[PDB]
Each structure stands twice: as C-alpha cells, then as structure tokens.
C-alpha cells in the first residue's frame, strides 16, 4: 500500500563492490517503476523477461535490487548467458532472468581524483560462479602447482584487485553504478493494482 523505497537503493550514498554486491529486498510496498523509466539520468535500462513500459501493470512476489559498481566495459556483460570477467567471477546472471538491469554514469560520485581504490573485483576463481552467488571469501589463488597456502607470491595471486577509477579515465572505462532489479512471477506483495 505504501510506496516502495527505490530511493534507498538508487539514491544510496555508495554501492558495495561487485564481488560483494548488495542484495536489498523490497516487499510489502507499492512499486512505481515509471519514475525509473522516465528518469533521464539512466545511461542504460534493459529489462529481460518483462517490457519496461508494463512494469507498473503486473504484480511481483518480491523484488531484489542487486546493487554494485563496475566499469563501462563491464556493463555489457551484465546480461543472461553472456560470459567474461564480471559475469564469471563476481556476478553471473542466470540464463532465465526475469528482471531489469540499470546502470548510469557515476564519474562525479564515486571516482575521486588520483584514483579511487575502494572498489574491488575478483580476477581469479577456481571455477565460474553459479547464478546469484556471492564469493565474498578472499582466499589466495593457487595458480601454480605449489600449494603455498599463505602469503601471496609466485603463482599465488590475491583474487581481489582494485578498479582504480580516475576522473580523467575514458568513458568506456568509467564507473557505472549497476542496480539489477530481479522479480519472480504465489502470494505477491510488491505491486499496486
């Protein structure tokens, strides 16, 4: 009956790094996605499994707002089926996805002068993540045949590395704060009419 807190997600002061994407649960509220579509601040807005113009016409069981930050070259791989680095070691979207993907420029928000090293991502992992998996654990990658199991070194790589965003960086390599909305088609409580 009350209005959903999409401002608690999109207008958040900061987003967790991609390897530990925040998972805000939205329910027991009436959602108005139109202000999302009609907003002119979104660089991208692509919904899979539902048309963007009919969002405030269906009714959803629950809403999950996976919020994180990646680079401009990495936004393209936030999509079902597509593989890469983000879609294989940080956040793999399921093949049968029924939600939305939102990303907008954040050059003046979370990219400080000289290089903001606050955002991290997983270069290496043993295998590809299952869809909707959070590998927050930071264990030394044993790339080589020597089981070091300790301080990083030769072929013992730290999996978490920083983007290092700068204001002078190119547009294609700039921080795009992604907010993947996920819906499921059962009692439903995050809709209006």
């Amino acid at each position, epitope marked *: 009956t009350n209005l959903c807190p999409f401002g608690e997600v999109f207008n958040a002061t900061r987003f967790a790094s991609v390897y530990a994407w925040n998972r805000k649960r939205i329910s027991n509220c009436v959602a108005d996605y139109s202000v999302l579509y009609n907003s002119a601040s979104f660089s991208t807005f692509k919904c899979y499994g539902v048309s963007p113009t009919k969002l405030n016409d269906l009714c959803f069981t629950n809403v999950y707002a996976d919020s994180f930050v990646i680079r401009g070259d990495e936004v393209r791989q936030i999509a079902p089926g597509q593989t890469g680095k983000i879609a294989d070691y940080n956040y793999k979207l399921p093949d049968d996805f029924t939600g939305c993907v939102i990303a907008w420029n954040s050059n003046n928000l979370d990219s400080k002068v000289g290089g903001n090293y606050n955002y991290l991502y997983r*270069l*290496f992992r043993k295998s590809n993540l299952k869809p909707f998996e959070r590998d927050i654990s930071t264990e030394i990658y044993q*790339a*080589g045949s*020597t089981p070091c199991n300790g301080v*990083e*070194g*030769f*072929n*013992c*790589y*730290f999996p978490l*590395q920083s983007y290092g965003f700068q204001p002078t960086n190119g547009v294609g390599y700039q921080p795009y704060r992604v907010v993947v909305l996920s819906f499921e088609l059962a009692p439903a409580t995050v809709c209006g009419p």
Partner: antibody
Amino acid sequence: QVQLVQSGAEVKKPGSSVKVSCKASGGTFSSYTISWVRQAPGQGLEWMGRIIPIFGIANYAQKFQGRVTITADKSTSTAYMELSSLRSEDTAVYYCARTPLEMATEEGYFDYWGQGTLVTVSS
Amino acid sequence: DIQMTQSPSSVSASVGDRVTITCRASQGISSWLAWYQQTPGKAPKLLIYAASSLQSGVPSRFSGSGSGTDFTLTISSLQPEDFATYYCQQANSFPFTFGPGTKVDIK
C-alpha cells in the same frame, strides 16, 4: 624477435628517486611479466620485483617491499620501476626481464632482457 | 630466502674442455631452475629452464639436470665464445635468488 629497451644511465643524488622504464618492443601485453633485476658492479644479480601488466598484480621482494614500487603502463607497453628513496649502496645496473606467461600462470626463468640503466652516483 | 651457492668460481678450461658448474638450493625447489650466462658488459641470456628443458637459441653444449636440491650444469665443449659467468636461480620461492656466480675465465 622481442627486444626490451630501457632509459639512459640516470645519475641522481642519494635520497632521491628514479623512474627508469622498460619498453617491451614486441609481444602481446598478455604474455609477459616484466621482472626487474639489479646487478651491482662486481656482485651477482639481485631481484627486486615483478609486475603482470595484464593482471596488474605486482608482488615484490621483502627486502625491497615498500622501498621499490613498479607500474606497468599497458597503454604504451612500457613497464616502469620507481626506486623510492634511492640511498645507501643502491648504485647498480638495473635490468628488466620478461618471464613468459601462459594462460594465467607466471613461469619465471627470465629469458628476454634489457640493456640496463647504469644508475651510478659518480662523476 | 633460498640462498643458492654454486661450485667454486675459479674454473680454468682452455678450449673445448668439460666445465661443470653445480649449485645446490638451501631449501627444496623441486626441479625448477634457470641457468644463465653473464657475458662481459651484457645482459644474462637464459640457457636452461626447468633444469631439463634447454632454451631455444643456444647450443646443445649447455646442458644440465638434477632433482631436489643438487643441480648441475655441464658443458660438452667450451667454445671460445662461452667465456662468461654462469648464474642459476630458483622458480619455487618468490624472492628470486641468484647464485654468487661461477666465471670461466683465463688466468
């Protein structure tokens, strides 16, 4: 026929810093790990720290950790070594050597080397 | 932290002789090794990697083998060009250590 070319023979006073370079002329940026090796005159080779330009990870030697930092500018394929607070008896002839990288595992055995910036504090 | 040490540096071989240089690792480095060659006024050129795989681009004279800690380098015939210092490093520990240096030279 990959060849590595460094800067000139930098001559800086003790306590300062240098920014010697190493241009990896030839070879893709995802197949070498630039490793810097120093040689004092009359003394055997000594290794400070490697960098992986494609990954960006760069772990150093515990003797030179913090003392020495390395940056790999993949835009122009010229790995940079910064000798912060060059003092004591650091005067040597610093080489740069690329250890081949296969897939994602570093291999070592520095094969292709530079000519060496003879960083010496002398007239 | 693996302090390597070769055979005594003083080696005298005129030409076409057999000069063997052996370096032993303080710790266990399996079969990893990289023998080099310090020509005077030039960068070392890799000779043997992994202690069994001979590097491409150098003669078959520069051969070595071994396992565990005791590693060897053998030269079938000392050509006049090979009047250089020979170094070995490890590929197990990350703080790579080069041996003190065995130099085959005139007296």
